[PDB]
Amino acid sequence: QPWKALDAEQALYVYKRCYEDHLPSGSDRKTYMTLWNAWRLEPNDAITHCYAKCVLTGLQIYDPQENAFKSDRIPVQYQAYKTITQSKQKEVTEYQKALAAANAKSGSCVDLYNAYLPVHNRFVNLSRQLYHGTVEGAAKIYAAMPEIKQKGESFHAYCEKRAWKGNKQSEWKNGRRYKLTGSPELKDAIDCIFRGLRYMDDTGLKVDEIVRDFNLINKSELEPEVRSVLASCKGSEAYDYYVCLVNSRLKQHFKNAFDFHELRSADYAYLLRKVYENPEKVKEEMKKLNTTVHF
Ligand SMILES: CCCCC/C=C\C\C=C/C=C/C=C/C[C@@H](O)CCCC(=O)O
C-alpha cells in the first residue's frame, strides 16, 4: 500500500507477544525459551510450530489473509535500515528468493513451520539483522532513531514527552493521574498510548486487547462489562474510549489494568519468565524504569 518496514520496537513487540502467547507454563517454559532465545526453531512440535507462525505473521513475512509468504517485503525491510545493519544485498536477494519458493499450503502452524524451516536454517543470521533480532543490532537502530520508544521506557512516558513538548507544563508533571481535561495534549498522549499498547491500530479498536489487560490483572469476570463500556462509548478516538473506561463502574480496575500495561510496555520481557501481583507492586517496579510513576 506500499508495505512499511518494521522498526526495532515493532519487532521486539512481535517477539515478546509471541513468547507470551506460545510459551508453555511450568517447568517446560525454560526449555522452549532457551532454544527460542538462541533462534533455534526447536523442538519440532506444535508449540514451536505455532510460535513460528506467530512470529512470521507478526513480522509480516507471512500474510494470513492471502495465505502467502510475502517475498518482496524482505528487500523493503532491508532497504529501510541498510546503512545501519550493513547486510549484503546479494544475501537479501537470496533470502527473498528462498521465500518465493516456499509453499504455505494450508497456512496451519505445521505447514508454515515446515515451509520456513530450511529458509530459517539458511538465513537465520541475516534475518536477525533485517528484523532487529540481536541485542547489539537493535541497539544500533535505537541509537540512530531516537523517535522509537526505547527499552526501559513506558509508552506512557514516551507519549507524554511528545504530547507536552511546548511551553505548557505536562498534566503528568508530578506523576501520571487519571484527571480528564479534554486538552489537545492529553488527547494526543492517549492516542499515542493506545496505539503503543495495541488497543488501536490503523484498522481501529481492538476490543480483545483491552479485555486481555483485564484478564492479566485477574479480572476475567469483567469481560462483558469491558465490552459493554467500549460498545456504548460515543466517539471513536482513543481519548473517547479512555474517558468511557475511566468514568465507568470499571474505573479502578481499568486504572490497575492500564498501570500494569504501563509497566509491561517499559519492560517487554516482564511476563516472559512474573505475573500480576497488585497495584502497589506495579508502582514499585515502575520506579526502576523510565515511566510516569509518582516518586
Ligand atoms: C525472522 C523470521 C523468524 C521466524 C521464525 C520464528 C521465530 C524465530 C526464532 C526465535 C526468535 C526469538 C526472538 C527473541 C527476541 C530477540 O531476538 C530480540 C533481540 C532484541 C532485543 O532484545 O533488544
Tab-separated table of C-alpha atoms and ligand atoms in Angstrom:
chain	number	residue	atom	x	y	z
A	1	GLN	CA	0.000	0.000	0.000
A	2	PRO	CA	3.046	0.056	-0.061
A	3	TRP	CA	4.409	-2.124	2.754
A	4	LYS	CA	6.115	-0.375	5.681
A	5	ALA	CA	9.272	-1.823	7.259
A	6	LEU	CA	9.281	-2.634	10.970
A	7	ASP	CA	11.445	-0.765	13.447
A	8	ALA	CA	13.237	-2.253	16.459
A	9	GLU	CA	10.346	-1.696	18.876
A	10	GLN	CA	7.833	-3.164	16.431
A	11	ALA	CA	9.956	-6.290	16.019
A	12	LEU	CA	10.551	-6.607	19.788
A	13	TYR	CA	6.798	-6.344	20.333
A	14	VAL	CA	6.239	-9.261	17.950
A	15	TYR	CA	8.869	-11.432	19.630
A	16	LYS	CA	7.647	-10.767	23.176
A	17	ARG	CA	3.939	-11.101	22.378
A	18	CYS	CA	4.600	-14.384	20.588
A	19	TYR	CA	6.566	-15.629	23.618
A	20	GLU	CA	3.618	-14.651	25.840
A	21	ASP	CA	1.112	-16.439	23.661
A	22	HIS	CA	3.131	-19.608	22.952
A	23	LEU	CA	5.493	-20.354	25.830
A	24	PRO	CA	4.177	-23.177	27.967
A	25	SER	CA	3.678	-22.589	31.690
A	26	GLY	CA	5.523	-24.631	34.317
A	27	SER	CA	8.831	-26.497	34.034
A	28	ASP	CA	8.739	-26.643	30.221
A	29	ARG	CA	8.856	-22.824	29.928
A	30	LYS	CA	12.649	-22.564	30.397
A	31	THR	CA	13.420	-25.313	27.844
A	32	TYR	CA	11.485	-23.682	24.979
A	33	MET	CA	12.682	-20.198	25.912
A	34	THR	CA	16.351	-21.340	25.869
A	35	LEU	CA	16.016	-22.764	22.351
A	36	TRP	CA	13.948	-19.867	21.001
A	37	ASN	CA	16.235	-17.235	22.590
A	38	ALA	CA	19.031	-18.845	20.564
A	39	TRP	CA	16.855	-18.560	17.416
A	40	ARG	CA	16.541	-22.327	17.135
A	41	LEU	CA	13.195	-23.491	15.755
A	42	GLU	CA	13.181	-26.463	18.104
A	43	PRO	CA	11.822	-28.737	19.383
A	44	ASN	CA	9.842	-29.973	16.382
A	45	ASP	CA	6.383	-29.906	17.977
A	46	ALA	CA	3.137	-27.896	17.849
A	47	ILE	CA	4.311	-25.405	20.500
A	48	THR	CA	7.249	-24.368	18.311
A	49	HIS	CA	5.177	-24.666	15.113
A	50	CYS	CA	2.645	-22.105	16.290
A	51	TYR	CA	5.335	-19.911	17.789
A	52	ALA	CA	6.967	-19.809	14.339
A	53	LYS	CA	3.631	-18.951	12.710
A	54	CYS	CA	3.131	-16.184	15.289
A	55	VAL	CA	6.489	-14.573	14.532
A	56	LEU	CA	6.185	-14.930	10.750
A	57	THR	CA	2.752	-13.289	10.962
A	58	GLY	CA	3.870	-10.512	13.325
A	59	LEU	CA	6.916	-9.626	11.223
A	60	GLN	CA	4.525	-9.704	8.231
A	61	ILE	CA	6.694	-12.192	6.346
A	62	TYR	CA	3.530	-14.325	6.152
A	63	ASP	CA	0.195	-12.723	5.296
A	64	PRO	CA	-2.719	-14.697	6.815
A	65	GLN	CA	-5.401	-13.154	4.556
A	66	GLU	CA	-3.594	-14.054	1.343
A	67	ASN	CA	-2.161	-17.193	2.955
A	68	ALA	CA	1.127	-16.238	1.322
A	69	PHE	CA	4.790	-15.660	2.067
A	70	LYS	CA	5.470	-12.074	1.057
A	71	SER	CA	8.902	-12.370	-0.558
A	72	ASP	CA	9.095	-8.793	-1.826
A	73	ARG	CA	8.770	-7.388	1.694
A	74	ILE	CA	12.224	-8.720	2.581
A	75	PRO	CA	14.096	-6.241	0.372
A	76	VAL	CA	11.838	-3.439	1.707
A	77	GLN	CA	12.741	-4.377	5.293
A	78	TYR	CA	16.399	-4.459	4.270
A	79	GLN	CA	16.368	-1.120	2.441
A	80	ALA	CA	14.818	0.751	5.371
A	81	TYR	CA	17.808	0.065	7.685
A	82	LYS	CA	20.623	-0.984	5.322
A	83	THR	CA	23.026	1.788	6.400
A	84	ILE	CA	22.790	0.513	9.991
A	85	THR	CA	22.701	-3.280	9.516
A	86	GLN	CA	25.250	-3.412	6.695
A	87	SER	CA	23.527	-6.589	5.479
A	88	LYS	CA	24.612	-7.689	1.998
A	89	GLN	CA	22.261	-7.091	-0.959
A	90	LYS	CA	23.268	-10.430	-2.519
A	91	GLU	CA	22.182	-12.358	0.603
A	92	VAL	CA	18.955	-10.348	0.882
A	93	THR	CA	18.036	-11.324	-2.701
A	94	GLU	CA	18.814	-14.971	-1.893
A	95	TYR	CA	16.552	-14.779	1.198
A	96	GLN	CA	13.761	-13.197	-0.864
A	97	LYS	CA	14.131	-15.955	-3.462
A	98	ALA	CA	14.068	-18.764	-0.878
A	99	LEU	CA	10.819	-17.279	0.476
A	100	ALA	CA	9.367	-17.107	-3.033
A	101	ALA	CA	9.940	-20.882	-3.326
A	102	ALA	CA	8.196	-21.626	-0.032
A	103	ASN	CA	4.761	-23.293	-0.082
A	104	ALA	CA	2.380	-22.105	2.653
A	105	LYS	CA	-0.053	-24.931	1.795
A	106	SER	CA	-2.936	-24.736	4.329
A	107	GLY	CA	-1.332	-21.956	6.378
A	108	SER	CA	-1.514	-24.132	9.509
A	109	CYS	CA	1.223	-23.808	12.124
A	110	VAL	CA	2.924	-27.011	10.938
A	111	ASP	CA	2.637	-26.115	7.236
A	112	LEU	CA	4.294	-22.734	7.799
A	113	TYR	CA	6.948	-24.237	10.082
A	114	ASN	CA	7.789	-26.946	7.542
A	115	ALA	CA	8.000	-24.419	4.698
A	116	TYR	CA	10.008	-21.842	6.620
A	117	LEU	CA	12.400	-24.193	8.444
A	118	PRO	CA	15.048	-24.581	5.713
A	119	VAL	CA	14.810	-20.858	4.920
A	120	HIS	CA	15.441	-20.158	8.609
A	121	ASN	CA	18.323	-22.617	8.742
A	122	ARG	CA	19.971	-20.946	5.733
A	123	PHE	CA	19.291	-17.290	6.581
A	124	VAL	CA	18.913	-17.091	10.361
A	125	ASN	CA	21.765	-14.609	10.860
A	126	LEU	CA	20.612	-12.355	8.022
A	127	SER	CA	17.029	-12.490	9.307
A	128	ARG	CA	18.218	-11.366	12.741
A	129	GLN	CA	19.973	-8.398	11.118
A	130	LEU	CA	16.966	-7.433	8.979
A	131	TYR	CA	14.321	-7.858	11.682
A	132	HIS	CA	16.227	-6.481	14.688
A	133	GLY	CA	16.674	-9.866	16.329
A	134	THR	CA	20.008	-9.243	18.078
A	135	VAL	CA	20.533	-7.090	21.172
A	136	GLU	CA	23.561	-5.343	19.620
A	137	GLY	CA	21.909	-4.775	16.237
A	138	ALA	CA	18.682	-3.447	17.742
A	139	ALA	CA	20.741	-1.099	19.948
A	140	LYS	CA	22.200	0.454	16.783
A	141	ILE	CA	18.674	1.066	15.471
A	142	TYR	CA	17.564	2.814	18.694
A	143	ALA	CA	20.755	4.902	18.704
A	144	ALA	CA	20.192	6.022	15.091
A	145	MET	CA	16.454	6.579	15.556
A	146	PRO	CA	15.667	8.442	18.823
A	147	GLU	CA	11.979	8.667	17.818
A	148	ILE	CA	11.494	4.942	18.613
A	149	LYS	CA	10.289	4.038	22.126
A	150	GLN	CA	13.328	2.615	23.904
A	151	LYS	CA	13.609	-0.471	26.073
A	152	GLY	CA	13.010	0.571	29.695
A	153	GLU	CA	10.761	3.460	28.629
A	154	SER	CA	6.988	3.056	29.001
A	155	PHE	CA	4.684	4.062	26.201
A	156	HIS	CA	3.035	6.448	28.639
A	157	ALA	CA	6.359	8.243	29.233
A	158	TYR	CA	7.364	8.173	25.567
A	159	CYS	CA	3.981	9.629	24.585
A	160	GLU	CA	3.992	12.243	27.382
A	161	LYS	CA	7.311	13.607	26.045
A	162	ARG	CA	5.781	14.102	22.598
A	163	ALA	CA	2.373	15.372	23.726
A	164	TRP	CA	3.784	18.084	26.016
A	165	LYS	CA	6.775	19.434	24.103
A	166	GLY	CA	5.915	23.154	24.195
A	167	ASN	CA	5.623	25.839	26.866
A	168	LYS	CA	2.673	24.215	28.675
A	169	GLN	CA	3.575	22.066	31.678
A	170	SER	CA	2.702	18.380	31.391
A	171	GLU	CA	-0.505	17.367	33.149
A	172	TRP	CA	1.553	14.442	34.451
A	173	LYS	CA	4.491	16.523	35.763
A	174	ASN	CA	4.121	15.244	39.346
A	175	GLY	CA	3.232	11.736	38.065
A	176	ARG	CA	0.533	10.495	35.689
A	177	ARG	CA	-3.017	10.601	37.015
A	178	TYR	CA	-6.496	9.972	35.615
A	179	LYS	CA	-7.680	13.587	35.561
A	180	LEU	CA	-9.801	14.127	32.453
A	181	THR	CA	-9.120	17.573	30.971
A	182	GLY	CA	-10.022	17.067	27.307
A	183	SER	CA	-6.877	19.031	26.443
A	184	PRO	CA	-5.356	18.598	22.960
A	185	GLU	CA	-2.174	17.352	24.640
A	186	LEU	CA	-3.973	14.717	26.712
A	187	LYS	CA	-5.897	13.527	23.657
A	188	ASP	CA	-2.620	13.220	21.749
A	189	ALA	CA	-0.860	11.385	24.581
A	190	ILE	CA	-3.754	8.940	24.908
A	191	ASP	CA	-3.855	8.242	21.153
A	192	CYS	CA	-0.110	7.570	21.208
A	193	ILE	CA	-0.518	5.275	24.222
A	194	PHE	CA	-3.490	3.354	22.822
A	195	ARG	CA	-1.524	2.693	19.625
A	196	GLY	CA	1.607	1.724	21.604
A	197	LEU	CA	-0.400	-0.733	23.721
A	198	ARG	CA	-2.077	-2.099	20.556
A	199	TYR	CA	-5.518	-1.108	21.862
A	200	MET	CA	-5.948	0.517	18.445
A	201	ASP	CA	-4.221	0.403	15.085
A	202	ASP	CA	-4.921	1.542	11.516
A	203	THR	CA	-7.974	-0.791	11.463
A	204	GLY	CA	-9.480	0.811	14.584
A	205	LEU	CA	-10.345	-0.526	18.026
A	206	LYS	CA	-9.167	-3.890	19.322
A	207	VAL	CA	-11.730	-4.773	21.982
A	208	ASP	CA	-9.967	-8.087	22.651
A	209	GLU	CA	-6.694	-6.320	23.525
A	210	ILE	CA	-8.311	-4.163	26.190
A	211	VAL	CA	-10.061	-7.283	27.556
A	212	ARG	CA	-6.646	-9.038	27.635
A	213	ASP	CA	-5.382	-6.348	30.022
A	214	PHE	CA	-8.273	-7.032	32.422
A	215	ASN	CA	-7.572	-10.778	32.146
A	216	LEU	CA	-3.941	-10.054	33.045
A	217	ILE	CA	-4.987	-8.431	36.358
A	218	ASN	CA	-7.153	-11.485	37.161
A	219	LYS	CA	-10.443	-9.780	36.307
A	220	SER	CA	-11.719	-12.188	33.637
A	221	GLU	CA	-15.215	-11.908	35.108
A	222	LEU	CA	-15.342	-8.246	33.981
A	223	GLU	CA	-15.058	-9.083	30.268
A	224	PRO	CA	-18.757	-8.478	29.456
A	225	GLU	CA	-18.611	-5.105	31.267
A	226	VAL	CA	-15.419	-4.074	29.457
A	227	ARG	CA	-17.101	-4.924	26.143
A	228	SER	CA	-20.278	-3.060	27.153
A	229	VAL	CA	-18.422	0.103	28.214
A	230	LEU	CA	-16.471	0.215	24.948
A	231	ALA	CA	-19.549	-0.636	22.868
A	232	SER	CA	-21.660	2.147	24.363
A	233	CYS	CA	-18.876	4.732	24.082
A	234	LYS	CA	-19.827	7.577	21.751
A	235	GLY	CA	-16.818	8.610	19.741
A	236	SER	CA	-14.138	6.530	18.127
A	237	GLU	CA	-10.959	8.332	19.208
A	238	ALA	CA	-8.565	6.783	21.718
A	239	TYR	CA	-9.403	9.594	24.159
A	240	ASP	CA	-13.124	8.816	23.881
A	241	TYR	CA	-12.598	5.183	24.915
A	242	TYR	CA	-10.249	6.234	27.698
A	243	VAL	CA	-12.905	8.652	29.062
A	244	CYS	CA	-15.575	5.954	28.810
A	245	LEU	CA	-13.452	3.478	30.800
A	246	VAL	CA	-12.317	5.985	33.418
A	247	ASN	CA	-15.830	7.317	34.056
A	248	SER	CA	-17.435	3.857	34.255
A	249	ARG	CA	-18.038	1.393	37.100
A	250	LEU	CA	-14.762	-0.218	35.851
A	251	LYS	CA	-12.741	2.863	36.901
A	252	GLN	CA	-10.389	1.328	39.459
A	253	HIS	CA	-9.967	-1.918	37.549
A	254	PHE	CA	-9.138	-0.023	34.384
A	255	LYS	CA	-6.560	2.060	36.265
A	256	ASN	CA	-4.980	-1.150	37.560
A	257	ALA	CA	-5.009	-2.774	34.097
A	258	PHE	CA	-3.628	0.321	32.348
A	259	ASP	CA	-0.948	0.859	35.030
A	260	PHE	CA	0.141	-2.787	34.711
A	261	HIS	CA	0.389	-2.346	30.951
A	262	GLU	CA	2.454	0.801	31.517
A	263	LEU	CA	4.974	-1.371	33.370
A	264	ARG	CA	4.842	-4.097	30.732
A	265	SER	CA	5.283	-1.508	27.966
A	266	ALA	CA	8.555	-0.406	29.604
A	267	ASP	CA	9.869	-3.960	30.019
A	268	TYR	CA	8.878	-6.201	27.101
A	269	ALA	CA	10.428	-9.185	28.921
A	270	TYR	CA	8.259	-8.695	32.029
A	271	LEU	CA	5.943	-11.714	31.629
A	272	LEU	CA	8.468	-13.968	29.890
A	273	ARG	CA	9.956	-15.926	32.838
A	274	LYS	CA	6.498	-12.757	36.722
A	275	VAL	CA	2.717	-12.370	36.904
A	276	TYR	CA	0.439	-9.612	38.183
A	277	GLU	CA	0.702	-9.071	41.920
A	278	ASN	CA	-1.126	-5.881	42.954
A	279	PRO	CA	-1.159	-2.133	42.170
A	280	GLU	CA	1.454	-1.246	44.819
A	281	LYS	CA	3.938	-3.796	43.453
A	282	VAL	CA	3.404	-2.433	39.928
A	283	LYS	CA	4.194	1.092	41.140
A	284	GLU	CA	7.381	-0.074	42.898
A	285	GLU	CA	8.547	-1.871	39.745
A	286	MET	CA	7.828	1.217	37.614
A	287	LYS	CA	10.106	3.358	39.809
A	288	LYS	CA	13.082	1.370	38.456
A	289	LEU	CA	12.262	2.302	34.855
A	290	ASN	CA	11.558	5.367	32.705
A	291	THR	CA	7.838	5.647	33.467
A	292	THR	CA	5.186	8.170	34.521
A	293	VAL	CA	5.005	6.825	38.098
A	294	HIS	CA	4.827	9.031	41.212
A	295	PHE	CA	8.052	9.234	43.225
B	1	LIG	C1	12.762	-13.633	11.018
B	1	LIG	C2	11.635	-14.635	10.927
B	1	LIG	C3	11.719	-15.645	12.059
B	1	LIG	C4	10.527	-16.592	12.018
B	1	LIG	C5	10.806	-17.844	12.835
B	1	LIG	C6	10.236	-17.658	14.220
B	1	LIG	C7	10.970	-17.320	15.282
B	1	LIG	C8	12.466	-17.092	15.249
B	1	LIG	C9	13.064	-17.737	16.477
B	1	LIG	C10	13.307	-17.078	17.614
B	1	LIG	C11	13.043	-15.653	17.796
B	1	LIG	C12	13.481	-15.291	19.000
B	1	LIG	C13	13.245	-13.870	19.232
B	1	LIG	C14	13.928	-13.443	20.514
B	1	LIG	C15	13.891	-11.929	20.650
B	1	LIG	C16	15.270	-11.315	20.428
B	1	LIG	O1	15.768	-11.729	19.262
B	1	LIG	C17	15.173	-9.804	20.413
B	1	LIG	C18	16.565	-9.180	20.497
B	1	LIG	C19	16.495	-7.652	20.523
B	1	LIG	C20	16.491	-7.127	21.945
B	1	LIG	O2	16.263	-7.923	22.888
B	1	LIG	O3	16.711	-5.903	22.130
